[PDB]
Design a protein around this nucleic acid. Sequence first.
DNA 1: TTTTCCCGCCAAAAA
DNA 2: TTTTTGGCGGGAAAA
Length: 186
Amino acid sequence: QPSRKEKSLGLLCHKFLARYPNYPNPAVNNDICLDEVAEELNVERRRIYDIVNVLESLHMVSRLAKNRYTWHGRHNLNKTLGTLKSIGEENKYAEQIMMIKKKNSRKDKSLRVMSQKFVMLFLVSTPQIVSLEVAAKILIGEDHVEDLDKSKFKTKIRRLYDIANVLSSLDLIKKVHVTEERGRKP
DNA sequence: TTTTCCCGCCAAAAA
DNA sequence: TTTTTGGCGGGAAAA
């Protein structure tokens, strides 16, 4: 009971990846998030919401209808990271680390897009990370006189933590100290 | 002590 | 309206 890991996002995420094969074929494929809430004794739907939203940021899954997702799988993965490299503003990111090191729709908004730009920034000759990339999220997110500092940035650290441990479950990431980098599949 | 991050209020898109 | 989808921060367990 006392342990906080029993309700950690990476447990139910590991079970979520256990629910479906990484390499399926077009069969009777469907997802019902409330049926996931009922098939086990947990949890509140918001957890499956953020897990599903981060899952579709890499095109691993797709929306079909209300309470109706399709699992798809590992096919696009490499094509998704490569298309993200076509979208990549990598020079702005590496230059942003040079700054921090010393001295469509307006409200899309932040979840899937931040996971996408995270997966984009993961590729570089010298993988560097990660709260500096949170500062990149503040600069891309604001780029205005306010600032509006102190607040906001910590919550981006929180959702970035959720993106971190959710990407720690049978996927392309490591567990190295803090500020981690891995992309197993090129 | 700081870092890690869960729970869930509460409000925007759908129904 | 009620419902489904998720931002958003607090507040505490864990390192």
